[PDB]
C-alpha cells in the first residue's frame, strides 16, 4: 500500500475545493474534488470514443476516428452522429486536462513543493486548446480542428501543412523544431552524465558533481551545473511548445500563402535585390 517513508507525509490539508470531503486516497492515487472531476471526464470521453467506434462500423483501434463537424456547421452545434460527439469529447478532454492540473496543484501544496509541474502542464494544455479551440474559432469553423484517430489526425497534420506548401519554411516552426531537437539532445546528455557518475567503472567509488563538471569542461569547455541543467530542460521544453503554438496560431489567420514565399522579403531587400548572381539572381 504505502512506501516505506510515505506515512509521515499523508496529512489533512492543502485542498482548494472542499475540505475533509474528498480528502483521501484510493490505493496510491490521491482523489480530491478534481480527482473526481478528472475521473468522470476521462471515463466519459473514453466511453464516447468507443461509442463513436460503434457508430462508425469499425473495431480496429487504429481505424477508429471521431471527425469534427463539417465546415458548413460553422461554430454551432452538430448532430451527434456527424459532428457532435467530437464536440462532447473535446469538452470532456478539456475538463479532464484542467482538473488534472488542479489536482496536481492540490498535491503540490499538500507536499509543500513549488507549483512548477502544473505550470509546465498548463503549457501543453494551452497548445492543445490552440489546435482545437482558438484556431478553429478565429478561422470560424470547428472543422479546422483535428479528428480523434490514431492515424487520421496525422492526415489532418499533413493536409494542414501542405495547404501552405512545405510547412518547415514557417519561421516560428523552425524555432520550435530547433528547441525540440536541443531538448532531446540535452535530455540524453543529462541522463547519461548522472548515470555515468553514479555508475562508474567496476569497483570504483561514486563520482561527485565535481567529476561531472570536469567531464563536461573537458569535453566542450563549459558546464552549466545541476540547477542550470534542470532550468534549461524546463525552459527548452516550454519554449518548444510555445513556439509550436505560435506557429500554428499565425498560420491560417495572418499568413495565407506559401511560407517559402515569406522568406523572399530578405532576398528582395533593396540594397542587394538586383545584384546578378547566385541562386536568386
Amino acid at each position: 500500500a504505502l512506501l516505506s517513508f510515505e506515512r509521515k507525509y499523508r496529512v489533512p490539508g492543502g485542498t482548494l475545493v472542499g475540505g475533509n470531503l474528498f480528502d483521501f486516497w484510493v490505493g496510491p492515487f490521491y482523489v480530491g474534488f478534481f480527482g473526481v472531476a478528472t475521473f468522470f471526464f476521462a471515463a466519459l470521453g473514453i466511453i464516447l470514443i468507443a461509442w463513436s467506434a460503434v457508430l462508425q462500423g469499425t473495431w480496429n483501434p487504429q481505424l477508429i476516428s471521431v471527425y469534427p463537424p463539417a465546415l458548413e456547421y460553422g461554430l454551432g452545434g452538430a448532430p451527434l452522429a456527424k459532428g457532435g460527439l467530437w464536440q462532447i469529447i473535446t469538452i470532456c478532454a478539456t475538463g479532464a486536462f484542467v482538473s488534472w492540473a488542479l489536482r496536481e496543484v492540490e498535491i503540490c501544496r499538500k507536499l509543500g513543493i513549488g507549483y512548477h509541474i502544473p505550470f509546465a502542464f498548463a503549457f501543453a494544455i494551452l497548445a492543445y486548446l490552440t489546435l482545437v479551440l482558438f484556431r478553429p474559432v478565429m478561422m470560424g469553423a470547428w472543422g479546422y480542428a483535428f479528428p480523434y484517430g490514431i492515424w487520421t489526425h496525422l492526415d489532418w497534420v499533413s493536409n494542414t501543412g501542405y495547404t501552405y506548401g512545405n510547412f518547415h519554411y514557417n519561421p516560428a516552426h523552425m524555432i520550435a523544431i530547433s528547441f525540440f531537437f536541443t531538448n532531446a539532445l540535452a535530455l540524453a546528455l543529462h541522463g547519461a552524465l548522472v548515470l555515468s557518475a553514479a555508475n562508474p567503472e567496476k569497483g570504483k567509488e561514486m563520482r561527485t558533481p565535481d567529476h561531472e563538471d570536469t567531464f563536461f569542461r573537458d569535453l566542450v569547455g563549459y558546464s552549466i551545473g545541476t540547477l542550470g541543467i534542470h532550468r534549461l530542460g524546463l525552459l527548452l521544453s516550454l519554449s518548444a511548445v510555445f513556439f509550436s503554438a505560435l506557429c500554428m496560431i499565425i498560420t491560417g489567420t495572418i499568413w495565407f500563402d506559401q511560407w517559402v514565399d515569406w522568406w523572399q522579403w530578405w532576398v528582395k531587400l533593396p540594397w542587394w535585390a538586383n545584384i546578378p548572381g547566385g541562386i536568386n539572381g
Partner: protein, 305 residues
Amino acid sequence: EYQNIFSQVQVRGPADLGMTEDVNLANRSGVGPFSTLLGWFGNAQLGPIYLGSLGVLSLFSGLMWFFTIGIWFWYQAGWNPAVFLRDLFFFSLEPPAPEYGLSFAAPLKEGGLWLIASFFMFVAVWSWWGRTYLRAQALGMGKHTAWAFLSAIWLWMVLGFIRPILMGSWSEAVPYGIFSHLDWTNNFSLVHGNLFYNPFHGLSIAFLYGSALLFAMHGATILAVSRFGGERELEQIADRGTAAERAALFWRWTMGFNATMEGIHRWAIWMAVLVTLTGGIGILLSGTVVDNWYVWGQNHGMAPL
C-alpha cells in the same frame, strides 16, 4: 514567489580547475573568462577545455568540412559578398547525380566536392565519439554518454552512408545546405508515399514528444523540490533526503507510480536514445523494404482500404 528560474544573487571565487583522476593535465588549457550573463542562468565559468590527439583530429576534420562547404558556397555566389549574404540558406553542396551510382568518378562540381566534404565530416564525427569515450574513461566514469552518442551517430550514418549504399547511389544522401536539406526531407517523404505511415517514424515522433514531456516533468520536479536541495541528485542517490521522497510521492499520488533519483535518469537516457534508434531503423527500411508507406499502412490495418 521566488521560482528559482534565475539566480537573484551571483557570487564568484577562484576558478575550479577540475578533477585530476588520471587526466593528462598537460593537455588542458587555462580557465577562460567568467560571464555574468551565463551566471544568471547557470555557471559563469568558461573552460578549461581538454584538447588531445582526438581533439586535434576532430577539430582539423570538422574545420576542413566546414571550409569545404563554405568555399563551395563562395563559388556559387560568384565571389560576391553581397550575393553570399543574400543567398545564404539557398546554397547547397549536392551529392553526385543518380547516374553515377556509388562510384567516385563524379566531377568536382557535380558531387566530388560533396564526397570530399563527407569524408571530412565522417572523420570529425567518429573522432569526436572516441573523444567522448576517452574523456569518460580518464575520469573513471561509465560510458553512458558514448552509447547515447552512438545512437545519434547511428541515425546520422544511416542518413548519409548506410542507406545510400544499400540503395546503390550517392544521390540518396542529404545535401549540405540550410533550405536544401529541408527540401530533401520533404521530397524524401513525398517519394516514399507518406512518411507519417512509417511505424518507426511514428515511434520516433512518440519518443521525441516523450523526451519533451519527460524533460519538462523532470526539470519542473527538481525545481519544485530545489527548496530542499533536490538539485544535488548525486547525493540524494547516496543519502535519500526529503526532496527525493517528496518528488516520488508527488508522482505516486498523481499517476500511481514513481521513479527514484537514478531510475528517472535511466528513463531519460532511454527516452532519447529511442527516438534516434527507431528513426534510424525507419529510414533504413524506406525504399529498401517499403517504397510506399501509405499502401503498406492500408495492407497492415492502419489506413482505410
